[PDB]
Amino acid sequence: SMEQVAMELRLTELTRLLRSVLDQLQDKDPARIFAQPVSLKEVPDYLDHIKHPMDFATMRKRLEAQGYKNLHEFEEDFDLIIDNCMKYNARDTVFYRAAVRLRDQGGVVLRQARREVDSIG
């Protein structure tokens, strides 16, 4: 149907906007702490601690399959990156601190992304 195509075009355009958001957020992680999944070879107990691991590469795979239907879903995954790190790692660590800085800086980007998603529809 033509209605299905129109919904598909909206999903495609959201995907474009989320790709630009994702790029901007990942620039706020210049150390690349959150670039890839925590390795279970290197942190074998990780899944005993963290039930839903997340990282920027995993988000990018989902994004490229047009797997985020709305901004809320995308934000959920970004918050997992931050929140998982702040649980597993202590306050005095470079990891925790990186997460706090990513959260604070990413907040700015996400605030305007929400306006754009609502604005453009």
Side-chain angles (χ1 to χ4, degrees), residues 24-34 56 78-79 81-83 85-86 90-110:
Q24 288 180 67
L25 294 174
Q26 189 154 20
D27 286 339
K28 310 310 178 163
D29 171 32
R32 302 191 68 86
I33 290 162
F34 305 104
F56 284 128
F78 178 68
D79 285 333
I81 295 177
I82 297 315
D83 291 341
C85 183
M86 294 175 71
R91 234 162 5 257
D92 72 334
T93 62
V94 63
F95 309 108
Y96 184 115
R97 288 162 179 278
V100 166
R101 293 162 62 82
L102 178 61
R103 192 198 58 186
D104 286 346
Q105 294 195 283
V108 183
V109 174
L110 287 166

Short mmCIF file of all heavy atoms in Angstrom, two decimals, residues 24-34 56 78-79 81-83 85-86 90-110:
data_model
loop_
_atom_site.label_atom_id
_atom_site.label_comp_id
_atom_site.label_asym_id
_atom_site.label_seq_id
_atom_site.Cartn_x
_atom_site.Cartn_y
_atom_site.Cartn_z
N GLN A 24 27.08 12.31 16.90
CA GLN A 24 27.30 13.37 17.83
C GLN A 24 27.52 12.85 19.26
O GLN A 24 28.41 13.31 19.95
CB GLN A 24 26.17 14.35 17.80
CG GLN A 24 26.17 15.21 16.52
CD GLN A 24 25.02 16.16 16.57
OE1 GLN A 24 25.00 17.04 17.40
NE2 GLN A 24 23.98 15.92 15.75
N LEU A 25 26.74 11.86 19.68
CA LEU A 25 26.96 11.26 21.03
C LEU A 25 28.29 10.54 21.10
O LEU A 25 29.04 10.69 22.08
CB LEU A 25 25.84 10.30 21.35
CG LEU A 25 24.51 10.91 21.52
CD1 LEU A 25 23.47 9.78 21.68
CD2 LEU A 25 24.48 11.89 22.66
N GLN A 26 28.67 9.78 20.09
CA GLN A 26 29.88 9.05 20.16
C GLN A 26 31.11 9.95 20.12
O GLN A 26 32.15 9.64 20.63
CB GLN A 26 29.91 8.06 19.02
CG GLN A 26 31.06 7.08 19.10
CD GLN A 26 30.86 5.71 18.40
OE1 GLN A 26 30.04 5.53 17.52
NE2 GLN A 26 31.63 4.73 18.83
N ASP A 27 30.97 11.13 19.54
CA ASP A 27 32.06 12.10 19.64
C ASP A 27 32.36 12.57 21.05
O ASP A 27 33.48 13.11 21.29
CB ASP A 27 31.75 13.35 18.78
CG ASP A 27 31.89 13.12 17.30
OD1 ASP A 27 32.58 12.18 16.87
OD2 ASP A 27 31.27 13.92 16.55
N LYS A 28 31.37 12.49 21.94
CA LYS A 28 31.53 12.78 23.33
C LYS A 28 32.22 11.68 24.15
O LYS A 28 32.23 11.75 25.41
CB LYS A 28 30.20 13.13 23.97
CG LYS A 28 29.37 14.20 23.22
CD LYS A 28 30.13 15.44 22.88
CE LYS A 28 29.18 16.36 22.09
NZ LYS A 28 29.75 17.70 22.09
N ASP A 29 32.72 10.68 23.44
CA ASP A 29 33.46 9.49 24.03
C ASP A 29 34.74 9.36 23.28
O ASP A 29 35.00 8.41 22.56
CB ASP A 29 32.66 8.17 23.91
CG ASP A 29 33.46 6.92 24.30
OD1 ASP A 29 34.35 6.99 25.20
OD2 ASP A 29 33.11 5.85 23.80
N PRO A 30 35.64 10.36 23.48
CA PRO A 30 36.83 10.30 22.59
C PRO A 30 37.83 9.19 22.96
O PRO A 30 38.56 8.73 22.12
CB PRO A 30 37.49 11.67 22.79
CG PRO A 30 36.93 12.25 24.03
CD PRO A 30 35.58 11.58 24.32
N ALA A 31 37.75 8.72 24.21
CA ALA A 31 38.55 7.59 24.62
C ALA A 31 38.05 6.23 24.04
O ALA A 31 38.75 5.20 24.12
CB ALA A 31 38.51 7.54 26.13
N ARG A 32 36.87 6.21 23.39
CA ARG A 32 36.30 4.98 22.86
C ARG A 32 36.02 3.90 23.89
O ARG A 32 35.99 2.71 23.59
CB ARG A 32 37.04 4.41 21.66
CG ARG A 32 37.08 5.47 20.50
CD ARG A 32 37.57 4.89 19.15
NE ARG A 32 36.69 3.98 18.55
CZ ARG A 32 35.65 4.26 17.75
NH1 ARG A 32 35.34 5.52 17.46
NH2 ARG A 32 34.88 3.34 17.29
N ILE A 33 35.70 4.35 25.11
CA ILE A 33 35.34 3.44 26.19
C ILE A 33 34.07 2.68 25.90
O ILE A 33 33.95 1.47 26.28
CB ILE A 33 35.33 4.23 27.52
CG1 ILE A 33 36.79 4.62 27.90
CG2 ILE A 33 34.64 3.45 28.62
CD1 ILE A 33 36.92 5.74 28.91
N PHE A 34 33.16 3.34 25.19
CA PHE A 34 31.80 2.74 24.95
C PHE A 34 31.59 2.26 23.50
O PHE A 34 30.46 1.89 23.09
CB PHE A 34 30.76 3.76 25.34
CG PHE A 34 30.94 4.24 26.72
CD1 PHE A 34 31.47 5.49 26.97
CD2 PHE A 34 30.71 3.39 27.75
CE1 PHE A 34 31.67 5.94 28.27
CE2 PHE A 34 30.92 3.82 29.08
CZ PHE A 34 31.41 5.11 29.34
N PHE A 56 28.11 1.29 21.61
CA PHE A 56 27.77 2.06 20.43
C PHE A 56 27.74 1.19 19.12
O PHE A 56 26.95 1.42 18.20
CB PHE A 56 28.71 3.23 20.20
CG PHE A 56 28.50 4.41 21.09
CD1 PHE A 56 29.55 4.97 21.83
CD2 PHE A 56 27.27 5.04 21.16
CE1 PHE A 56 29.39 6.09 22.59
CE2 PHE A 56 27.11 6.17 21.95
CZ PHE A 56 28.18 6.69 22.68
N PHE A 78 20.91 4.15 24.68
CA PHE A 78 21.97 5.05 25.17
C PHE A 78 22.08 5.10 26.69
O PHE A 78 23.19 5.01 27.29
CB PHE A 78 21.77 6.44 24.61
CG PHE A 78 22.76 7.46 25.07
CD1 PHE A 78 24.06 7.38 24.67
CD2 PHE A 78 22.38 8.53 25.84
CE1 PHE A 78 25.01 8.30 25.05
CE2 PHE A 78 23.33 9.52 26.20
CZ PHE A 78 24.64 9.38 25.81
N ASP A 79 20.95 5.13 27.34
CA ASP A 79 20.95 5.13 28.80
C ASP A 79 21.51 3.83 29.39
O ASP A 79 22.17 3.91 30.42
CB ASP A 79 19.53 5.38 29.32
CG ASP A 79 19.11 6.84 29.15
OD1 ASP A 79 19.92 7.76 29.12
OD2 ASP A 79 17.92 7.08 29.17
N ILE A 81 23.96 2.14 28.07
CA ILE A 81 25.45 2.28 28.01
C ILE A 81 25.95 2.93 29.32
O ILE A 81 26.92 2.41 29.97
CB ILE A 81 25.90 3.03 26.74
CG1 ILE A 81 25.57 2.25 25.46
CG2 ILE A 81 27.38 3.41 26.87
CD1 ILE A 81 25.90 2.95 24.16
N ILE A 82 25.37 4.08 29.67
CA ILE A 82 25.76 4.90 30.81
C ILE A 82 25.49 4.17 32.11
O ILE A 82 26.36 4.07 33.02
CB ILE A 82 24.96 6.23 30.81
CG1 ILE A 82 25.28 7.05 29.55
CG2 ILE A 82 25.19 7.01 32.10
CD1 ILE A 82 26.76 7.11 29.23
N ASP A 83 24.24 3.70 32.23
CA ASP A 83 23.80 3.15 33.48
C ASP A 83 24.52 1.84 33.84
O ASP A 83 24.84 1.58 35.02
CB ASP A 83 22.30 2.96 33.46
CG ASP A 83 21.54 4.25 33.45
OD1 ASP A 83 22.03 5.31 33.80
OD2 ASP A 83 20.31 4.19 33.11
N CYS A 85 27.57 1.04 32.98
CA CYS A 85 28.96 1.43 33.35
C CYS A 85 28.99 1.94 34.79
O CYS A 85 29.90 1.62 35.56
CB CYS A 85 29.41 2.49 32.39
SG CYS A 85 31.13 3.00 32.68
N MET A 86 28.02 2.79 35.16
CA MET A 86 27.98 3.40 36.49
C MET A 86 27.65 2.38 37.59
O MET A 86 27.84 2.73 38.78
CB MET A 86 27.03 4.63 36.53
CG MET A 86 27.65 5.70 35.64
SD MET A 86 26.65 7.22 35.39
CE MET A 86 26.81 7.90 36.99
N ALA A 90 33.29 1.55 39.84
CA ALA A 90 33.20 2.48 40.98
C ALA A 90 33.39 3.90 40.60
O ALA A 90 33.98 4.24 39.56
CB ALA A 90 34.22 2.03 42.06
N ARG A 91 32.93 4.80 41.46
CA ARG A 91 33.08 6.28 41.27
C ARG A 91 34.45 6.82 40.96
O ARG A 91 34.59 7.80 40.22
CB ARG A 91 32.56 6.99 42.54
CG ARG A 91 31.53 8.02 42.31
CD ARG A 91 30.71 8.42 43.54
NE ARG A 91 31.01 7.90 44.88
CZ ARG A 91 30.35 6.94 45.52
NH1 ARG A 91 29.36 6.27 44.94
NH2 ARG A 91 30.73 6.59 46.74
N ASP A 92 35.48 6.19 41.51
CA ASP A 92 36.85 6.62 41.36
C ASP A 92 37.56 6.12 40.08
O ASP A 92 38.80 6.25 39.96
CB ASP A 92 37.65 6.21 42.64
CG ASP A 92 37.93 4.69 42.75
OD1 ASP A 92 37.17 3.84 42.20
OD2 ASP A 92 38.90 4.29 43.45
N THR A 93 36.82 5.63 39.09
CA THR A 93 37.41 5.00 37.96
C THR A 93 37.26 5.84 36.74
O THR A 93 36.27 6.62 36.60
CB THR A 93 36.84 3.60 37.64
OG1 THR A 93 35.41 3.65 37.32
CG2 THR A 93 37.07 2.58 38.84
N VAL A 94 38.19 5.65 35.81
CA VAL A 94 38.09 6.37 34.53
C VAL A 94 36.83 5.98 33.77
O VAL A 94 36.23 6.75 33.06
CB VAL A 94 39.39 6.12 33.66
CG1 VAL A 94 39.58 4.66 33.27
CG2 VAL A 94 39.36 6.94 32.42
N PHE A 95 36.41 4.72 33.92
CA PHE A 95 35.17 4.26 33.25
C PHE A 95 33.94 4.99 33.71
O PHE A 95 33.12 5.50 32.92
CB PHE A 95 35.03 2.73 33.46
CG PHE A 95 36.25 1.95 33.11
CD1 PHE A 95 37.06 1.36 34.07
CD2 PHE A 95 36.55 1.75 31.82
CE1 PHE A 95 38.19 0.63 33.76
CE2 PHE A 95 37.68 0.99 31.47
CZ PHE A 95 38.51 0.45 32.46
N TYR A 96 33.73 5.03 35.04
CA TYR A 96 32.55 5.72 35.64
C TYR A 96 32.55 7.17 35.21
O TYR A 96 31.52 7.74 34.82
CB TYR A 96 32.54 5.56 37.16
CG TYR A 96 31.35 6.12 37.89
CD1 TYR A 96 30.45 5.30 38.56
CD2 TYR A 96 31.20 7.50 38.04
CE1 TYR A 96 29.34 5.81 39.20
CE2 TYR A 96 30.15 8.01 38.81
CZ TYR A 96 29.23 7.15 39.40
OH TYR A 96 28.16 7.70 40.09
N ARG A 97 33.73 7.79 35.37
CA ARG A 97 33.84 9.20 35.06
C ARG A 97 33.53 9.50 33.59
O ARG A 97 32.94 10.55 33.29
CB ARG A 97 35.18 9.75 35.51
CG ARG A 97 35.23 9.85 37.04
CD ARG A 97 36.61 9.96 37.60
NE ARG A 97 36.52 10.07 39.08
CZ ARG A 97 36.27 11.18 39.80
NH1 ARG A 97 36.05 12.38 39.23
NH2 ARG A 97 36.20 11.07 41.15
N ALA A 98 33.95 8.63 32.70
CA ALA A 98 33.67 8.76 31.24
C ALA A 98 32.16 8.73 31.00
O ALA A 98 31.62 9.46 30.18
CB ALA A 98 34.36 7.71 30.45
N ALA A 99 31.50 7.84 31.71
CA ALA A 99 30.06 7.71 31.61
C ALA A 99 29.35 8.98 32.08
O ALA A 99 28.36 9.42 31.44
CB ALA A 99 29.53 6.47 32.37
N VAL A 100 29.78 9.58 33.21
CA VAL A 100 29.15 10.78 33.69
C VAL A 100 29.29 11.89 32.61
O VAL A 100 28.28 12.61 32.37
CB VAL A 100 29.84 11.27 35.02
CG1 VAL A 100 29.41 12.70 35.33
CG2 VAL A 100 29.43 10.34 36.13
N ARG A 101 30.49 12.06 32.04
CA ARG A 101 30.76 13.08 31.06
C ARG A 101 29.95 12.88 29.76
O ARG A 101 29.37 13.84 29.21
CB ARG A 101 32.25 13.18 30.73
CG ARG A 101 33.04 13.69 31.93
CD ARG A 101 34.52 13.40 31.82
NE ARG A 101 35.08 14.08 30.66
CZ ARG A 101 35.44 15.36 30.63
NH1 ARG A 101 35.33 16.13 31.73
NH2 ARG A 101 35.95 15.87 29.49
N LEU A 102 29.82 11.62 29.37
CA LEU A 102 28.95 11.23 28.21
C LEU A 102 27.50 11.54 28.46
O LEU A 102 26.79 12.15 27.60
CB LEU A 102 29.20 9.78 27.85
CG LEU A 102 28.33 9.26 26.71
CD1 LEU A 102 28.55 10.01 25.42
CD2 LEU A 102 28.65 7.77 26.50
N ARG A 103 26.99 11.20 29.65
CA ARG A 103 25.63 11.53 30.02
C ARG A 103 25.39 13.07 29.96
O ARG A 103 24.37 13.57 29.39
CB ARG A 103 25.40 11.01 31.44
CG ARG A 103 23.98 10.97 31.97
CD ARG A 103 24.08 10.87 33.48
NE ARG A 103 24.82 11.96 34.08
CZ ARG A 103 25.14 12.05 35.37
NH1 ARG A 103 24.82 11.12 36.20
NH2 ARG A 103 25.79 13.10 35.82
N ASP A 104 26.29 13.82 30.56
CA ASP A 104 26.08 15.27 30.68
C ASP A 104 26.13 15.95 29.33
O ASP A 104 25.20 16.75 29.02
CB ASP A 104 27.15 15.86 31.62
CG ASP A 104 26.88 15.53 33.12
OD1 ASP A 104 25.75 15.07 33.46
OD2 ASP A 104 27.81 15.77 33.93
N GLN A 105 27.10 15.57 28.50
CA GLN A 105 27.26 16.12 27.18
C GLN A 105 26.20 15.63 26.22
O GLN A 105 25.72 16.42 25.38
CB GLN A 105 28.65 15.81 26.67
CG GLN A 105 29.69 16.56 27.51
CD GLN A 105 31.03 16.58 26.82
OE1 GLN A 105 31.73 15.60 26.83
NE2 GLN A 105 31.38 17.71 26.23
N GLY A 106 25.81 14.38 26.32
CA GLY A 106 24.80 13.81 25.42
C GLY A 106 23.42 14.39 25.67
O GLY A 106 22.58 14.50 24.71
N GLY A 107 23.15 14.81 26.91
CA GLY A 107 21.86 15.42 27.30
C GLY A 107 21.48 16.58 26.41
O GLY A 107 20.33 16.69 25.95
N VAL A 108 22.48 17.41 26.11
CA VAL A 108 22.33 18.59 25.25
C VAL A 108 21.83 18.19 23.82
O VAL A 108 20.91 18.77 23.24
CB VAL A 108 23.69 19.31 25.12
CG1 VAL A 108 23.55 20.59 24.29
CG2 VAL A 108 24.31 19.59 26.51
N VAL A 109 22.45 17.14 23.29
CA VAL A 109 22.22 16.66 21.94
C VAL A 109 20.83 16.07 21.89
O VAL A 109 20.03 16.29 20.93
CB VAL A 109 23.27 15.58 21.59
CG1 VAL A 109 23.03 14.92 20.23
CG2 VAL A 109 24.65 16.23 21.59
N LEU A 110 20.51 15.30 22.92
CA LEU A 110 19.22 14.63 22.95
C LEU A 110 18.06 15.59 23.14
O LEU A 110 16.97 15.30 22.65
CB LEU A 110 19.18 13.54 24.05
CG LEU A 110 20.01 12.28 23.69
CD1 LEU A 110 20.16 11.46 24.97
CD2 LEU A 110 19.38 11.41 22.60
#
